[PDB]
Symmetry: C4
């Protein structure tokens, strides 16, 4: 067992090849499948796993009632092999949590699970399944984290947490964690910025995070930092707006785009110099469809021109949260860090006439060989027997 | 593989961080989940497992009928990974038993399973799944044991068993077991004492047990002993009474507190010099709620003042049995033995209008970082389809 | 990995301690549990497994209809950890078979599965899951084997097969198998004898088999042989008749006891010098109850006196097939071969008003410490929803 | 771990011994079993696995509706241990695919999964679960592959793919793959030939494929090639026609037999010099029954005489696709490559009045010891509760 280096560059990619699909909701119609949301993928030097937040209930059972609710003492972080349905019979317990993150440093798994009351939530950190540290809410207003994988470089793993209003200025902190122990943290000095549900990845020994501004931006904010937590902040400049909801594409801004800026969805983007791979919904108003767009100067340029678009989910099909995950050379045998992403396909409330809300997942990995756009939707027929 | 040393002290702790929650009853509404009671946790140098006594039946099935009954030829000891639901598809068979204990000596698992008739029950000892010894009832009146983990020190494991009345003077024996073989035992000379369902843990090469007086004590009896079984006995002196039922907190006694002393519930406490961490229900009369209380002189002092209280389960929510379990430095990498505990959340009879009785579980581990009180209840909606 | 020696003696035992109980039928009421019969246990140097013949159907499903039938192209030999319910989710596939045997030589598993038509059945031998040999019916009349574990000594495993009438003189052969290859066989010269469903075990480098005479004996026939297949034959002389049905106990015979000799049930017995441990039903007419009897001169003596009786299943409770299995010193660390046994508890047809027939199991191991008699019945409530 | 040599000859065999049967459809009546088609078996140096294409739905659930359809974004390649039912609880996710192949090179698994639109499908190659390459449709007309195992020789694995019409001249390419990377390919110059769903196996360092002519041949086309992809092509000459549908047996041809040549079914054959082992349906017009036929000069001779016939599935029972798979000496310890085969037993549409279509499987391995013909059918009772 050797810790991940994290010192190579991101693999440049021309397209995205489909990696997994679990068909969770379709199967859950009869099978014993957890009601879940906020799934995310993370890899070790040996395997890739799907993490998810359960509602402590199964699909098509009465206890799935009212699962549109985000937080409760019943939610737990669990994981299963990628591509498999999240079931009590194949899932590993990770932590009690209504907000979470996880990642592998090359030696062991780190998991971060937040639970407790809105006014004093506590993040429990585990390393190899053993509690190693905790961190308590410092603003007493819903301590919350990535809902995707943390990023690891040379034995240290990094994450971002938010505490405060989701409709105004909040507080954002970056953490450096070693063997499950917080060794350093810093509060981001970011007035007029808003950070939630960051998707973070390593690249050339440094961390880049693309996040969600729930306050007043329809473009996505970002934060990057080295291992010493020396950071920079900004917003993606592209007129190809990445959040949902958002305005129709037009001239962008290197600051928060106020038009349709309230609300949002977890997302991600991959930075390559001044360019950016943007993953976003197809609809500007609802969580429908998904597409990958290559914009060669979109990180710093404000125009709405782009070079490549690849369809992932049709515009008439349900999508939801999305996030980045990487495969390290230690796993692939490549000489660079390979970018991948996952998409949550949300079914149920509030858009459909059910008593429940749950999601299935698809994932893709970046390649330089031939690829194709299509639609890989959830495919479940609602409502269910329970409703 | 190396045997656990068990020679370090208990880690001092300031609070308790949530470690697991299985949501068993909620999931069992649809899923294939055992009807269980008396769950308990025990760890090896590699992993932690939940042990439990099944009724040889699944939730929401007709065979769950009359499972309020404690003893039958159908009950078996089984185990599964911590935090997972006890299902026939993920559970390991341990022993046929209606009373049980288990612990890992660093090399292999020891399980103790008692079955047979009330007037001649036999405890079957297994080491690495192989029968290694038996011990038969010596008072012919329901031979019974911990219903939680035994305690191991330097290759020897220790447990306590009781035989005789549950409403009067009985007989209590301590056992030393090596590789599943009883190498020594001694009967405790404890007139006017009553010991049942002991929660035992190792601390500085010696064993401490906190138990249940079902005869005439609303405070908890304790027994401690070295590897040679040289023992001491007493009662927790704190006016913060630990049993259920019990009187309102007042001046305590270093002997059995007779007020509300009959009946009781399995519980635990952690000794730290003259101080004590007490886990107990919130209700004085019923198995509802749960809390952890730090009383700096409560082991030997009779006053009812305490320093710390942490909420675990709300007073309006069902609780039940609770017990200690520890994580050895061989597992954690710490330089002390870490205290943890589990709580059984009992649903169904006799308090609820169902045909069945079963429990789910939560567990916590002691830390010195920030923690928070809350309520992590079972959360199931009764009655069920079967009733 | 080292092959089992099989050169030590059987462990003398004073009683039987309960080892496992699966509660298969109770759980199968709701859970996904195979309809099975002819379960048997067999051990490796590492673990013990339950083998069984499925009907290719689950309990409480329509395909369990008519499962009173013994042979079909749908029956398969499968195995699961001892004490666990036989489910498609925890069971390993072994072979297609309506008659079977299996055993571990210390290195790998040998399985023998017979399938095909009544007039030309073929036994398929597998070693480590790879087909290594076959043997075809030589009398064209239902080739059939032990339905319990084969016996292994120093890298060779031994079994017995029958071909011919089940109500008259048939043909019986002993086989020596090495790494799944038949290296020697011999036909037993046994006129007026009848051998079916032999329970065989190793003892001091030789094999002893106690079997079922379905033709004209209410006592059990036996055959013993060395590694070169030099054999001896006889019948258990004890007036404590072991088969079912049978007459009331009286003066026995060293030949087949004709009274109530037709029909029968698979069983076993352990030989100790002139003495014998006899396992049998409690009823003389039906497959009900079970008991272990120590008869110090019952192997060669014809009286009906005995020294020890231990209750296993109550007379009013269903029992069925039973068989021996052993635990080698390589597994236990003992200096002798430990005798164990299993009992099949048959529910359904023809005794009960269902459409199906299936069994659960219990098992016990021989010890010299204290034990107790009791009743550990199936405990399922019939009929089921499917009927 | 060492790569498979693949340099020995095929083991000559006189008959076929039954190896596995999963009873999938029977069990799926109640159990949680995938709706599947196109199952196939492939082995490593350690184990044999069943691969299959799911419809992302379970039997007896509403989502099984319209599963007669071959292609969709919901279909995935998964695998489970041979002989076990394909369940979400025991199946490993491999790839998103509506056409697939897989094989083990001695070190890791190679999987090939094709998904995407009919006019631009993309094959995703994975080595040890990691995407290693892609290949895109070159004729824009349903890129498709074996639906059985690829063949490996000395670290290189080989497969065949087709692009173009299924009712006329198409394009056929052979691929050489090393560690999941395409290192060479060549288009077959085969005017008037049609290749689909090839069954390929290694033999003396070279690859032989027997395939399906869906255009105008009732006999099967073949292609063989060395590691450098230098190939030869032809048709099986035997008047014992191997496809379905087909004419009654008569004089054959070394070219495509036009009579009943349109349409077909995936199948296989084993070449032995001028002789051939032919597996085929019993019905000439429908997918019913299955038999193995040894024709000593059937590879190059056009007569309709044969030497051996062995019944596998009765003519009145449903069959379906069939394919070859081999066990290498690295797995068996033999000095030759052992031939095995599997048969898909298709139930439901279009031949039966259900809303769904699915298959179970049986498999056999070649031996030189005694064997027997019989019928090992699916055995499910249709329709189901869902219909
Ligand atoms: C998921 O949650 C949904 C929201 O709760 C459930 O729907 C609700 O179902 C309840 C129970 O039937 C229903 O309850 C009330 O309102 C009734 C009129 O609409 C009223 O008649 C009920 O009260 C009367 O009866 C009760 C019981 O006897 C008495 O205690 C009262 O005093 C009175 O006599 C009761 O107030 C809701 O109307 C309904 N809500 C909605 C929005 O439909 C789903 O049932 C649940 N699904 C599952 C599968 O569990
Ligand atoms: C387990 O197997 C049991 C034995 O088969 C089943 O019980 C049987 O159920 C069948 C179907 O209902 C039933 O069938 C026949 O007999 C009827 C009179 O008893 C007769 O009316 C039926 O025939 C008529 O209808 C059919 C269909 O429309 C026509 O084809 C006929 O021409 C005629 O009009 C039919 O002959 C058996 O009576 C019954 N047997 C017994 C012993 O009860 C169970 O149903 C089965 N259980 C499960 C769960 O599958
Ligand atoms: C990346 O890290 C590895 C492991 O420490 C190191 O050997 C290598 O030199 C680094 N790569 C570069 C380009 O510096
Ligand atoms: C405890 O045992 C350890 C491990 O063998 C030993 O090294 C150490 O000396 C002991 N500690 C104490 C306090 O005696
Ligand atoms: C539950 O079991 C008891 C005891 O046998 C029985 O009296 C009662 O009728 C059962 N209840 C139901 C609802 O079946
Ligand atoms: C039994 O077999 C073992 C292993 O071959 C051998 O070492 C030993 O001598 C044998 N025991 C006796 C009593 O001969
Ligand atoms: C096949 O390869 C093996 C294994 O490396 C080699 O030893 C042997 O020489 C080869 N056999 C033939 C027939 O060439
Ligand atoms: C099955 O699916 C088809 C296609 O959507 C639909 O037309 C049909 O109504 C469905 N059948 C049933 C019984 O639901
Ligand atoms: Ca079910
Ligand atoms: Ca926004
Ligand atoms: Ca641009
Ligand atoms: Ca009390
Ligand atoms: Ca005090
Ligand atoms: Ca008889
Ligand atoms: Ca006698
Ligand atoms: Ca054809
Ligand atoms: Ca010929």
């Amino acid at each position: 067992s050797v810790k991940l280096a994290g010192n190579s560059s991101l693999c440049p990619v021309s397209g995205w090849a489909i990696y997994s699909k679990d068909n969770s909701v379709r199967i859950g119609s009869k099978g014993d499948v957890f009601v879940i949301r906020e799934p995310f993928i993370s890899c070790s030097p040996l395997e890739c796993r799907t993490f998810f937040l359960t509602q402590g209930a199964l699909l098509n059972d009465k206890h799935s009632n009212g699962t549109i609710k985000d937080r409760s003492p019943y939610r737990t972080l669990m994981s299963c092999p990628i591509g498999e349905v999240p079931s009590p019979y194949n899932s590993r317990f990770e932590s009690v949590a209504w907000s979470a993150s996880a990642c592998h440093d090359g030696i062991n798994w780190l998991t971060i699970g937040i639970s407790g009351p809105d006014n004093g939530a506590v993040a429990v950190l585990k390393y190899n399944g053993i509690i190693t540290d905790t961190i308590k809410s410092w603003r007493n207003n819903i301590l919350r984290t990535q809902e995707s994988e943390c990023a690891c470089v040379n034995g240290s793993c990094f994450t971002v947490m938010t505490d405060g209003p989701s409709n105004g200025q909040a507080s954002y902190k970056i953490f450096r964690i070693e063997k499950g122990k917080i060794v350093k943290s810093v509060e981001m000095n970011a007035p007029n910025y808003h950070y939630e549900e960051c998707s973070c990845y390593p690249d050339s020994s440094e961390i880049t995070c693309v996040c969600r501004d729930n306050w007043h931006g329809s473009n996505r904010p970002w934060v990057s930092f080295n291992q010493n937590l020396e950071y920079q902040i900004g917003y993606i400049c592209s007129g190809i707006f990445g959040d949902n909801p958002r305005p129709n594409d037009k001239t962008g801004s290197c600051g928060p785009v106020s038009s349709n800026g309230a609300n949002g969805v977890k997302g991600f983007s991959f930075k390559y110099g001044n360019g950016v791979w943007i993953g976003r919904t197809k609809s500007i108003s609802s969580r429908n469809g998904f597409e990958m767009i290559w914009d060669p100067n979109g990180w710093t340029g404000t125009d709405n021109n782009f070079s490549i678009k690849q369809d992932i989910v049709g515009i008439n099909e349900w999508s939801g949260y999305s996030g980045s995950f990487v495969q390290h050379p230690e796993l692939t045998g490549l000489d660079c860090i390979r970018p991948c992403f996952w998409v949550e396909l949300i079914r149920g409330r509030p858009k459909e006439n059910t008593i429940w809300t749950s999601g299935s997942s698809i994932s893709f990995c970046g390649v330089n060989s031939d690829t194709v756009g299509w639609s890989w939707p959830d495919g479940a027929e609602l409502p269910f027997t329970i409703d």
